[PDB]
């Protein structure tokens, strides 16, 4: 009902290409591997089936996924919660992650992201 939007589609087009640097330049991602829930094997097996998909997602951004972790990463991916990191033990990636200033996402967050930059995991 009113002509001109609040985002224009070279503004969005804008903020996406800057994350989409980001990805390709400089971001290393870690998918952690610790579960906070005894899920039966086949919940345990569909959440495993999106952390692929998600690894596919952010690998067409050009992202490095290291199987494993050290202080160059910068953004963990997990299934744990996101909010009560400073429970844990000092030995923990979770607490590492945050440790060294490092981006912690969950599942849900990732799969935002990815949709907010146009891919499609559905295919």
Do not use: C
Not at 19 to 41: A, C, G, L, P
């Amino acid at each position: 009902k009113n002509v001109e939007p609040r985002v224009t589609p070279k503004e969005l087009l804008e903020w996406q290409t800057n994350w989409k640097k980001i990805m390709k330049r400089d971001s290393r991602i870690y998918f952690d591997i610790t579960d906070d829930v005894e899920m039966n094997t086949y919940n345990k097996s569909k959440m495993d089936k999106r952390r692929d998909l998600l690894k596919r997602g952010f690998l067409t951004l050009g992202a490095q996924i290291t199987q494993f972790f050290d202080t160059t990463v910068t953004i963990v991916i997990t299934r744990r919660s996101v909010e009560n990191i400073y429970l844990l033990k000092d030995t923990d990636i979770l607490s590492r992650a945050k440790k060294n200033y490092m981006k912690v996402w969950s599942y849900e967050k990732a799969a935002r992201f990815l949709k907010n930059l146009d891919v499609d995991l559905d295919h």
